Structures are given as structure tokens and as C-alpha cells.
Design a protein around this nucleic acid. Structure first.
Ligand SMILES: [Mg+2]
Ligand SMILES: [Mg+2]
Ligand SMILES: [Mg+2]
Ligand SMILES: [Mg+2]
Ligand SMILES: [Mg+2]
Ligand SMILES: [Mg+2]
Ligand SMILES: [Mg+2]
Ligand SMILES: [Mg+2]
Ligand SMILES: [Mg+2]
Ligand SMILES: [Mg+2]
Ligand SMILES: [Mg+2]
Ligand SMILES: [Mg+2]
Ligand SMILES: [Mg+2]
Ligand SMILES: [Mg+2]
Ligand SMILES: [Mg+2]
Ligand SMILES: [Mg+2]
Ligand SMILES: [Mg+2]
Ligand SMILES: [Mg+2]
Ligand SMILES: [Mg+2]
Ligand SMILES: [Mg+2]
Ligand SMILES: [Mg+2]
Ligand SMILES: [Mg+2]
Ligand SMILES: [Mg+2]
Ligand SMILES: [Mg+2]
Ligand SMILES: [Mg+2]
Ligand SMILES: [Mg+2]
Ligand SMILES: [Mg+2]
Ligand SMILES: [Mg+2]
Ligand SMILES: [Mg+2]
Ligand SMILES: [Mg+2]
Ligand SMILES: [Mg+2]
Ligand SMILES: [Mg+2]
Ligand SMILES: [Mg+2]
Ligand SMILES: [Mg+2]
Ligand SMILES: [Mg+2]
Ligand SMILES: [Mg+2]
Ligand SMILES: [Mg+2]
Ligand SMILES: [Mg+2]
Ligand SMILES: [Mg+2]
Ligand SMILES: [Mg+2]
Ligand SMILES: [Mg+2]
Ligand SMILES: [Mg+2]
Ligand SMILES: [Mg+2]
Ligand SMILES: [Mg+2]
Ligand SMILES: [Mg+2]
Ligand SMILES: [Mg+2]
Ligand SMILES: [Mg+2]
Ligand SMILES: [Mg+2]
Ligand SMILES: [Mg+2]
Ligand SMILES: [Mg+2]
Ligand SMILES: [Mg+2]
Ligand SMILES: [Mg+2]
Ligand SMILES: [Mg+2]
Ligand SMILES: [Mg+2]
Ligand SMILES: [Mg+2]
Ligand SMILES: [Mg+2]
Ligand SMILES: [Mg+2]
Ligand SMILES: [Mg+2]
Ligand SMILES: [Mg+2]
Ligand SMILES: [Mg+2]
Ligand SMILES: [Mg+2]
Ligand SMILES: [Mg+2]
Ligand SMILES: [Mg+2]
Ligand SMILES: [Mg+2]
Ligand SMILES: [Mg+2]
Ligand SMILES: [Mg+2]
Ligand SMILES: [Mg+2]
Ligand SMILES: [Mg+2]
Ligand SMILES: [Mg+2]
Ligand SMILES: [Mg+2]
Ligand SMILES: [Mg+2]
Ligand SMILES: [Mg+2]
Ligand SMILES: [Mg+2]
Ligand SMILES: [Mg+2]
Ligand SMILES: [Mg+2]
Ligand SMILES: [Mg+2]
Ligand SMILES: [Mg+2]
Ligand SMILES: [Mg+2]
Ligand SMILES: [Mg+2]
Ligand SMILES: [Mg+2]
Ligand SMILES: [Mg+2]
Ligand SMILES: [Mg+2]
Ligand SMILES: [Mg+2]
Ligand SMILES: [Mg+2]
Ligand SMILES: [Mg+2]
Ligand SMILES: [Mg+2]
Ligand SMILES: [Mg+2]
Ligand SMILES: [Mg+2]
Ligand SMILES: [Mg+2]
Ligand SMILES: [Mg+2]
Ligand SMILES: [Mg+2]
Ligand SMILES: [Mg+2]
Ligand SMILES: [Mg+2]
Ligand SMILES: [Mg+2]
Ligand SMILES: [Mg+2]
Ligand SMILES: [Mg+2]
Ligand SMILES: [Mg+2]
Ligand SMILES: [Mg+2]
Lengths: 46, 95, 271
RNA sequence: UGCGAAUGCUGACAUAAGUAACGAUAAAGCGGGUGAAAAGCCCGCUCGCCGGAAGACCAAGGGUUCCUGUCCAACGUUAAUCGGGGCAGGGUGAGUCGACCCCUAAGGCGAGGCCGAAAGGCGUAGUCGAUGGGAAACAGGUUAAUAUUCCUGUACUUGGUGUUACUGCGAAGGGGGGACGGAGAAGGCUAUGUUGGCCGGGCGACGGUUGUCCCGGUUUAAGCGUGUAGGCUGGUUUUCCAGGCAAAUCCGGAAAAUCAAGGCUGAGGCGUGAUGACGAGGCGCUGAAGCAACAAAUGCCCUGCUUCCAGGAAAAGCCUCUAAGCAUCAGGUAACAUCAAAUCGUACCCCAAACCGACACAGGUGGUCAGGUAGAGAAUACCAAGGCGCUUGAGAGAACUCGGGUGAAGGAACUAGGCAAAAUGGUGCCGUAACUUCGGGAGAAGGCACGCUGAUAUGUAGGUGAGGUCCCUCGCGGAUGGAGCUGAAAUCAGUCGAAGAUACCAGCUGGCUGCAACUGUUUAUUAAAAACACAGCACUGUGCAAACACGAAAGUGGACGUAUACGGUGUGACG
RNA sequence: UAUAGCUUGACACUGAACAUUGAUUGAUGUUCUAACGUUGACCCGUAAUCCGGGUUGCGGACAGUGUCUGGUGGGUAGUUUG
């Protein structure tokens, strides 16, 4: 049957993209936390 | 267009079976060009350097494949492929 | 006219509709409609501020003239039209200078009638003028509350207010709810009553009829759980508590009006 | 600092055990080839399955899985020479397809602004935001892999510039259009199919088959011209008023003069496109026929028409009118000639082994195409095009389990309970009770006929409809006319079988009674119900800056509503 | 046991003049504008249903807000119930 993950790139980028993170302050804090940990991938941008 | 710009747009002639078949049947040469080279500057650089009269230019961006050199996995860079169509009375000059 | 459907199917048994043959058929006037998007009972925050709203048919908004500021210009009723936004029907009127507008169709006004609005206008159904010039005891509708704000009182179908007294600058009106309210005499009104008085004799007949108008199902608080409604749940059918709204406030008789700004304008409460 | 325990943590290895299982019972057999090795690879002939799909093609999602060569280390639930596996190379060609771009919906952000301990919330002007509106291409050919992109032929759209001949052009403004609902139906059509003609080939391993016989084909687009079935709508003129903030020659209103027409839209048809392409076959060359009638779409006219209430986007492109400003200038118009149409995607899978399910998983996944025979039918059965035999096989034919078939006599005696099974099942006609809200109950119940052949009637009723004749500007015209094609149903007589709704498909029925009026909703994953909802009823609050609700507040919903309205509560048709 | 909300009074924003009236000081009522409200009208910023300013009109020391305060307050919260 229908599972919980329905892949859509538009919804993905509008929810978790880089510009979405930079738009809000908590998103910028998330990006800072990810840069501090040394994540090779900050967001879902491709 | 800048003369220094046309010198850098061309990369290399593309050797292949399809390219050779098009060269002797459609009178079209396949060339490796810069990724940012447009059709206008491609035609200008070809007419300036190869000394051939270009009819029309078709381009396409080839995506790089994933390979493995030893134990490391890499991704080859992308490159644009130009189908330069010369006029019927024009042959190609190799220099 | 009023007509009862035939009990062919179980949904048409109790349906009682009102079909007006004098209403215009076809698309309304083009340069008088506006985009009207449904809300669903949700405010700017997105939460449901008013329950039981949502769905229904699509509706274009008809710009209705409630102020009637075009004074000293005769107008002729072109045709009565249907309005889904209000319970009263509207009438497209044409002015002497070639201007079309929407007005609340009063009771009895048919196509081809002459209407005017102004201090110099005449006393007839559909004419607008300041309440200081309207004779006492007359039945008016689309009455303003401020001098130049537009008609707010008696705008539904079959509603009307009566001028019970005029003393100085204020005019005492008897509202449709039985209230006596003082209003500035400089405010305007329209003679007659609001048409479509047979609107209250209609019966939907089925839940689908209510769902077409944007009304959603109402769940009784007694059928909910204690966490959902103050009436809460229980073992079987138990109430055991005073009836209250779903926020703790006691309904069924408790007055909720608290407004000291407009008490001076209210003569006698309803009953 | 000492380990045997803490259902202790990590790694390795036993046990069950060479046991279950190898993932839909659609199915395989044989010959040849390669190969170390062949049930699984390729080729060939038979067999079986799907065929509103297990076929074809897109949008999402994935990203090289696409094609070629090579390898069988690991992966593939077996082997593997094979692969969506490893390695190398190749492959995606656009002014016309989509993105991009112009315009907006819901919604988002938001200069100033308001509000708020801060962080921030709302929001004007604006700017983003498709799932919507806006310019333009078709047919054939070609690769191992791309094609509406490459080639051939034949087209179309937009913009810049230059020249020639005319000319009031101009918006961040006004008007029109864009521009819009459900259901029903038939008038003409087309896609398409059947048959007849013609063309090419055959005269059949077994009784006949030179004919009313067998097989196959019988195709052709966009565009341009013509302007038809149909649909909508009176046209031109002049004087006036100024509603569209200013103006208007535009729209709006008024008055008279005039003509019986005018304009817009519009499938399909025909000519051209096309002396071409394609074309069964024959020898990379050539290549005949390529027509007619009938039937007919859910597709087109049709954004039509009728009807109904629940009353059914916006803006831009486009047309039109002028303000400021410019008057041999600019700008606009018509013709021609050149230039430009950039960038990005294009491979491949999308009823799946490639997306979502940890899997090469009996699940899910939006959109378009829609052949023949029966059939009302997109059901169903068998087939076409096309695609597959589902990645462990070979034997035997125990109990037992699973899915089915049949069954003497009896027929619910079983069981908590007719659970499950068995049974009915279609068309046409006849006929049909209590009760009833007069609509129903009802397909009540029940009964009769159904195949094939001949005649009525060498094919009737009906449908379509050619040639000829007459009429009129003279035509895609009207009357006539009926060839031809097509074509039910009924009766009569005969006939065959056990049986003619012969297969698949395809109501079991009646009586009493509780509950809920009913159609609907509900505990995704043990409860679908008497529970929830519901139309109806009553009470109650609210006079608008409404009550009420979300918000420290601003603000928003209520509602661009106004007591015949809105909110809350209880009950639940109707008598 | 508290608290959001609702609600009562006092003080501040919050004034003027008169009449009645309880004790130089309070309360009541009637008029007024100048505080303040205006989700009434027009104009400007401005080719803007936000906002600000101006004029006018209507309300008007009312409403409303701040501190303190009495009541109510399973709406919410923390707990007890040997
Ligand atoms: Mg080209
Ligand atoms: Mg390209
Ligand atoms: Mg790189
Ligand atoms: Mg509009
Ligand atoms: Mg609204
Ligand atoms: Mg309600
Ligand atoms: Mg409405
Ligand atoms: Mg209810
Ligand atoms: Mg109700
Ligand atoms: Mg419950
Ligand atoms: Mg419970
Ligand atoms: Mg409670
Ligand atoms: Mg009980
Ligand atoms: Mg009791
Ligand atoms: Mg140890
Ligand atoms: Mg121990
Ligand atoms: Mg254990
Ligand atoms: Mg064992
Ligand atoms: Mg065993
Ligand atoms: Mg076994
Ligand atoms: Mg098996
Ligand atoms: Mg199994
Ligand atoms: Mg060999
Ligand atoms: Mg073999
Ligand atoms: Mg096999
Ligand atoms: Mg084979
Ligand atoms: Mg089927
Ligand atoms: Mg395919
Ligand atoms: Mg993609
Ligand atoms: Mg993947
Ligand atoms: Mg790709
Ligand atoms: Mg790979
Ligand atoms: Mg492959
Ligand atoms: Mg081996
Ligand atoms: Mg293996
Ligand atoms: Mg390979
Ligand atoms: Mg491979
Ligand atoms: Mg396009
Ligand atoms: Mg918006
Ligand atoms: Mg914002
Ligand atoms: Mg700011
Ligand atoms: Mg935009
Ligand atoms: Mg779109
Ligand atoms: Mg392909
Ligand atoms: Mg406009
Ligand atoms: Mg329009
Ligand atoms: Mg639309
Ligand atoms: Mg429709
Ligand atoms: Mg046809
Ligand atoms: Mg022959
Ligand atoms: Mg023989
Ligand atoms: Mg034949
Ligand atoms: Mg006119
Ligand atoms: Mg209609
Ligand atoms: Mg109605
Ligand atoms: Mg001028
Ligand atoms: Mg492609
Ligand atoms: Mg493709
Ligand atoms: Mg699909
Ligand atoms: Mg599947
Ligand atoms: Mg998968
Ligand atoms: Mg498999
Ligand atoms: Mg699968
Ligand atoms: Mg079929
Ligand atoms: Mg058939
Ligand atoms: Mg059948
Ligand atoms: Mg089959
Ligand atoms: Mg086949
Ligand atoms: Mg397939
Ligand atoms: Mg298998
Ligand atoms: Mg057996
Ligand atoms: Mg069995
Ligand atoms: Mg059986
Ligand atoms: Mg038996
Ligand atoms: Mg028997
Ligand atoms: Mg029996
Ligand atoms: Mg029995
Ligand atoms: Mg028994
Ligand atoms: Mg027994
Ligand atoms: Mg059963
Ligand atoms: Mg059965
Ligand atoms: Mg029957
Ligand atoms: Mg019955
Ligand atoms: Mg026909
Ligand atoms: Mg017999
Ligand atoms: Mg059934
Ligand atoms: Mg009982
Ligand atoms: Mg029920
Ligand atoms: Mg039901
Ligand atoms: Mg359940
Ligand atoms: Mg329920
Ligand atoms: Mg507020
Ligand atoms: Mg509001
Ligand atoms: Mg109840
Ligand atoms: Mg009851
Ligand atoms: Mg304002
Ligand atoms: Mg408590
Ligand atoms: Mg504690």
C-alpha cells in the first residue's frame, strides 16, 4: 500500500532547502550546528 | 567577440563512430567545447580558427559518469558537445 | 413561489424550495462582480476560529450599493437577479446618466420601476432619503447607523424597521429583533421591506443541501470525550452538568453582551 | 589491580541442520550454436499466458540502469557462456516539445506602518508563487543506442534594423475580451472498423477446390484556398447627456433617418500539398492497386443548445479611447530585404527488477491510445498489434495440509448460528399481496418462448443513399429519384440433442419482529454498529467596532454577512 | 492551593460651568469642549480599502487602558486522597 515517503523535489526544497533554512532564524541555527559538526551535506539541495 | 575569448571556447575534436558517420554523410563535425560556450561564439570561433564557413551549430551537455580509481570513487566533469554543420562546399582544416 | 417536491427519492421527500420566475436567468452584470474566495472558518493564523464552516459551492461577489449616494438621479429597475452571498435578491438599476448598480430588491419592486434617492426624493418603496424626512411609523430597510456609512440594519430577506419616533437629531427605530434603538436622523434608509419574504419557508430536505451552502456537520458536545468538550463523555448517555459552550461559558440563558460604548444608543432591550 | 553470571556490551563460532524454504499451479518440449561445462544464454520449430494488459506512450521519482565489446572474483534465493553485476568505450542535436519567459489563484515574503520584554507577529505599496491563461511544424528516412531536435520535402510564429508609399502617435489611465457551474439530449461529422471493387501471389501432404475460391495490400500529415452542417447577434447615420476619478473619437444612456438584411464563430467536405513519399513483391535498384458503400465513437463542432439551483477564478497577452508630451521630428500602418530566436532537459525505467515498500518483495503509483469475433457494455471468453512462460529443476504419486471436481439414500438431523458450501441468476411478454408518507413495496412472488433451416420477404419494417430529370445568381444549392449497401423483430412449417440464457458472465425467495427514518461517517492495523452525522425541532446569546473564536497586542475569522443572520446547546425524518 | 479569563470599586490618563445634596470637602444631575474614541465623510503624501497629517461630523470626560482590590473562575496548573 501507500507508504509515508512520496518523493517530490519541489516540496523537499520548499521544506528543507537552503533558502528555507536561511529564511528563518532557527534554520540558520540548524545550519550553524551542522557546520560545527562538519557535515558534508548541510541541506537537501541536491 | 573577443579574439582571446574564441581561442578558449574550443576544447578538442570529438572522435567517435557517430561523429565520423556524420562528418562524411551530413558534413558535420563534432567538437568538444567549453561548458559555457554558446552557439554564437562557437560558430564565430570555428569560422575564425578553422577558416570554415559554419551553417548551424547544435550543442548538448554530456553528464559525467561515476568511476572508481583504485579504492576511491570519482565523478567525471561535465562537458558540452557541439555538432558544427559546415556548408556543402566547405571541408575541414586540421591545425 | 413556494413549491413542495415529490417524494420520488428519500432525499426529495421533505424538500420545499422557492422558485421565483421573475428572477433573471444567465450570467450577472460583468463589471459588478468580484473574486470571493471561501475561508473555511480560519483567520490569518490558520486556526479554525469559527467551526462548521467550509466547503459549499463557488460564488462570485456582487457589489451591492448600500450607501445610495447617487442622489438627484432617477433610476429604473432593469431586472431582479439572484445573489448567493445574501438571502435577499438584488435588482440591477439603470441611472439617467447610464450607470448600473446593484441594490437590495425591496418587496414589490419589479423590472421597469422608477426609483430615486435623495432629500428631494419621493416616498415610495425603493427610494432612499434621510430618516429625518421619512414620516414616522413608516417601514424602512437598509438603514444606516452613521450618516454616510452604508446600510447595515434590516438587510436580510423579509426584514424591515419602523420609525417609532423622531426627537431632535435622533430617530428611535424598532428593529426586527424587537429592540428600540436611537439613530441619528441624518442617517439614510429605504422605504418598504426587503423582498424574498418567502425565503423562510424553504426546506433543504437532506444533509447534502446544507453541505452546498458551506455548512459542516455539528457534533454534539455530549457525544465527545471529557478532553474534547466540557459536556465530555461517560458510561452511556450522561449529562449531569449545566449546558455550556465548548469553552466553559454557560449557555442557555446567560447574557454575553458587555458594551458600555453603545448603551446610550439602546433604549429598550429585546424580549 | 583479579569476572561466570547483571534477559550485561562488542566480535567470533556452534545448535537446531544440511532441516524449512528457493517468493503466485501462465508451461513447457525438442534440434542446432558457442562454450571447460547448457533445463535457464542465442538461433529455429511446436506448446501455453496476457492482450482496458502481463500492450504503447508521458508527467513525477530515480540518474546512466540506455548501446557495444569484454569478464564470471562477489551479487542473481540453483548453474550460468546470461544480467538492471564488474571493466572500457559510445550514446541525449529544438525559433516550433517542456523548462525558461509575460500574467495571475490559494499562499509566502514585505520598503514605509502598526503591535510586541527581546527574539519577533500582522500587514500597505510591491514581489514571488501553477496544479491555470499567452506565438508558432507536419509526413517520410536514418543509428547499436537521439530524434516533432539529425536528412528530404513542404510549412508557421515572434522581434530588431534598413528602404519605399501613406498617416496623429502616446498610459503607471478608461472600456471590451480573456472569462469559466452541474445534468440531459440529438444534428452533422471524424478517428476507426466490416464488406464490395481493383491490384499482386496460390491452385494445396487427406475427400473437393479456376471460383460466389484462399492470402495480403488497398496509406498519405501539417500548412494554404474555398467557407458548409450548425451557433450567436439587426446593421449602418446624425444630433445630444456626461456614468466610467481628468479627457475621450471607446464603452454607458436618449432621440430621431434609414434599410431587411449585415457581422462574428464554426466541425466536417473538396482542391493543393502530392508527377512526391509509402507501398505487396521482384531483381543497393525497381516497385502495381492504392477506390466505394455501410456502421460508428466516451473524440470535434461544443467555451454550442435545453434545463436546474447549490448560481458557478484572477490577471496578463489581444482589440479599442484618449491625458501629459511630441507636429518636414518621433511614432503607427502596408510592402520588400536581411538579421535573431539565447540558455537549460532530451539516453532509459514509469499497470516497474530502475519510483515508494530494508529484497530482483503476490502491495501502491497521476495522465493519454483503445482492433476483430460474440456481448448492452472499457464486464466476460477467444484472438490481433505487441509482450511474456513469472531465476531452482528431475522423479514418486504415502498420511496429512492447501485450492478444486464428483457423489448413492436422506436433506440442516451439523453448529453458538445454514459459517462455508450448494442454489437463483438474461432478454421479451403476462402477472404480482399486506401495508404505504401514494412515490413505493416490485425485478414482489409466479409463469411462458429462446438453437439452426425455409417462406412470408431470392433481405420484410427501418436506415443510408448513387445515376438521371426539373428549378434558380448558378452552388459545399432545393425538389425528385430510387440503384446499391445496410438491416432488426414476428409468424408460420421443418429439423437436431438429455438439454438452445447451452460455455464465460449472470438477483436465492417469502413471513414475523427490535434498533436507527433514509443516502452517508467512524476506532489506518481484532469492534462498521443500535454508535457519529444528517434535513427537521426547541431553547438561548448577539444591534454590528455583534456575540463568539485565534492572538501579550496589532490584527483576523464570523462576514465584504446584519435578527428570514450568525454562534452555542440538546433532540433527531414524518404522525 | 493557585491562576488565565470575566467582573466590582479606588487612584492616573481626566477637564469646565452651573443646580440638588451629604459633611472648607465629597456625591448626584444637567449643559459644554479642549483631553480621549471614531472599523462616519472629504483632501494630501499617493497611479495604495495599510498608515500618517489636515478639515468636518458624531460621541466625550463616558468608554478604554495601567496599579491596587472584592467576587467568580476544573478553563488551566501543581498536588493530596493513611
Ligand atoms: Mg537544425
Ligand atoms: Mg538543446
Ligand atoms: Mg568534479
Ligand atoms: Mg472580474
Ligand atoms: Mg472572508
Ligand atoms: Mg454552528
Ligand atoms: Mg458569502
Ligand atoms: Mg448535531
Ligand atoms: Mg443541527
Ligand atoms: Mg464516545
Ligand atoms: Mg471510551
Ligand atoms: Mg473539563
Ligand atoms: Mg446509563
Ligand atoms: Mg442521574
Ligand atoms: Mg569472560
Ligand atoms: Mg559470581
Ligand atoms: Mg535468550
Ligand atoms: Mg528436523
Ligand atoms: Mg521433512
Ligand atoms: Mg522441502
Ligand atoms: Mg517454487
Ligand atoms: Mg511461500
Ligand atoms: Mg563444442
Ligand atoms: Mg537446447
Ligand atoms: Mg526454465
Ligand atoms: Mg526461443
Ligand atoms: Mg478484461
Ligand atoms: Mg518502452
Ligand atoms: Mg527528471
Ligand atoms: Mg536508486
Ligand atoms: Mg536523467
Ligand atoms: Mg552502474
Ligand atoms: Mg541492457
Ligand atoms: Mg563455475
Ligand atoms: Mg550463482
Ligand atoms: Mg553486456
Ligand atoms: Mg552492466
Ligand atoms: Mg512551446
Ligand atoms: Mg498574494
Ligand atoms: Mg508578511
Ligand atoms: Mg521594516
Ligand atoms: Mg510574478
Ligand atoms: Mg502549469
Ligand atoms: Mg529508444
Ligand atoms: Mg483593462
Ligand atoms: Mg469578460
Ligand atoms: Mg479557466
Ligand atoms: Mg457542463
Ligand atoms: Mg470515415
Ligand atoms: Mg488471380
Ligand atoms: Mg485430396
Ligand atoms: Mg479479401
Ligand atoms: Mg453609443
Ligand atoms: Mg448552461
Ligand atoms: Mg437559490
Ligand atoms: Mg490633448
Ligand atoms: Mg530526445
Ligand atoms: Mg525517450
Ligand atoms: Mg498509471
Ligand atoms: Mg507492481
Ligand atoms: Mg524497490
Ligand atoms: Mg524473481
Ligand atoms: Mg514487485
Ligand atoms: Mg474489445
Ligand atoms: Mg462486435
Ligand atoms: Mg452477455
Ligand atoms: Mg486469452
Ligand atoms: Mg502475437
Ligand atoms: Mg513490460
Ligand atoms: Mg520463481
Ligand atoms: Mg496429491
Ligand atoms: Mg481438500
Ligand atoms: Mg461442487
Ligand atoms: Mg448426496
Ligand atoms: Mg441424488
Ligand atoms: Mg428437499
Ligand atoms: Mg429448513
Ligand atoms: Mg439444531
Ligand atoms: Mg446437536
Ligand atoms: Mg453463506
Ligand atoms: Mg457457489
Ligand atoms: Mg421477475
Ligand atoms: Mg417482497
Ligand atoms: Mg452512415
Ligand atoms: Mg426431440
Ligand atoms: Mg451479487
Ligand atoms: Mg426482542
Ligand atoms: Mg442507520
Ligand atoms: Mg449506509
Ligand atoms: Mg479496526
Ligand atoms: Mg461513530
Ligand atoms: Mg481586537
Ligand atoms: Mg475583523
Ligand atoms: Mg441522541
Ligand atoms: Mg431515539
Ligand atoms: Mg485608514
Ligand atoms: Mg486538576
Ligand atoms: Mg512534583
Amino acid at each position: 500500500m501507500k507508504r509515508t515517503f512520496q518523493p517530490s523535489v519541489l516540496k523537499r526544497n520548499r521544506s528543507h532547502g537552503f533558502r528555507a533554512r536561511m529564511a528563518t532564524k532557527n534554520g540558520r541555527q540548524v545550519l550553524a550546528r551542522r557546520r560545527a559538526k562538519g557535515r558534508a551535506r548541510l541541506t537537501v539541495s541536491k | 567577440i573577443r579574439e582571446e575569448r574564441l581561442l578558449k571556447v574550443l576544447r578538442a575534436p570529438h572522435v567517435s563512430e557517430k561523429a565520423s558517420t556524420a562528418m562524411e554523410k551530413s558534413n558535420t563535425i563534432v567538437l568538444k567545447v567549453a561548458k559555457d560556450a554558446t552557439k554564437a561564439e562557437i560558430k564565430a570561433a570555428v569560422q575564425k580558427l578553422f577558416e570554415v564557413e559554419v551553417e548551424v551549430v547544435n550543442t548538448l551537455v554530456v553528464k559525467g559518469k561515476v568511476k572508481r580509481h583504485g579504492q576511491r570513487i570519482g565523478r567525471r566533469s561535465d562537458w558540452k558537445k557541439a555538432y558544427v554543420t559546415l556548408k556543402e562546399g566547405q571541408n575541414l582544416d586540421f591545425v | 413561489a413556494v413549491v413542495k417536491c415529490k417524494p420520488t427519492s428519500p432525499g426529495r421527500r421533505h424538500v420545499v424550495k422557492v422558485v421565483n420566475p421573475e428572477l433573471h436567468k444567465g450570467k450577472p452584470f460583468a463589471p459588478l462582480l468580484e473574486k470571493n474566495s471561501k475561508s473555511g472558518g480560519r483567520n490569518n493564523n490558520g486556526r479554525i476560529t469559527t467551526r462548521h464552516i467550509g466547503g459549499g459551492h463557488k460564488q462570485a461577489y456582487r457589489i451591492v450599493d448600500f450607501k445610495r449616494n447617487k442622489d438627484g438621479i432617477p433610476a429604473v429597475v432593469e431586472r431582479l437577479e439572484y445573489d448567493p452571498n445574501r438571502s435577499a435578491n438584488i435588482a440591477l438599476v439603470l441611472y439617467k446618466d447610464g450607470e448600473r448598480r446593484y441594490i437590495l430588491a425591496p418587496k414589490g419592486l419589479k423590472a421597469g420601476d422608477q426609483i430615486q434617492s435623495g432629500v428631494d426624493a419621493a416616498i415610495k418603496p425603493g427610494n432612499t432619503l434621510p430618516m429625518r424626512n421619512i414620516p414616522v411609523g413608516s417601514t424602512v430597510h437598509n438603514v444606516e447607523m452613521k450618516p454616510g456609512k452604508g446600510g447595515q440594519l434590516a438587510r436580510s430577506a423579509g426584514t424591515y424597521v419602523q420609525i417609532v419616533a423622531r426627537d431632535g437629531a435622533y430617530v428611535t427605530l424598532r428593529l426586527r429583533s424587537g429592540e428600540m434603538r436611537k439613530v441619528e436622523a441624518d442617517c439614510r434608509a429605504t422605504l418598504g421591506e426587503v423582498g424574498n419574504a418567502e425565503h423562510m419557508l424553504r426546506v433543504l430536505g437532506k444533509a447534502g443541501a446544507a453541505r452546498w451552502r458551506g455548512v459542516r456537520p455539528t457534533v454534539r458536545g455530549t457525544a465527545m470525550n471529557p478532553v474534547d468538550h466540557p459536556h465530555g463523555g461517560g458510561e452511556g448517555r450522561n449529562f449531569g452538568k449545566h449546558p455550556v459552550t465548548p469553552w466553559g461559558v454557560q449557555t442557555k440563558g446567560k447574557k454575553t453582551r458587555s458594551n458600555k460604548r453603545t448603551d446610550k444608543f439602546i433604549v429598550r432591550r429585546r424580549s
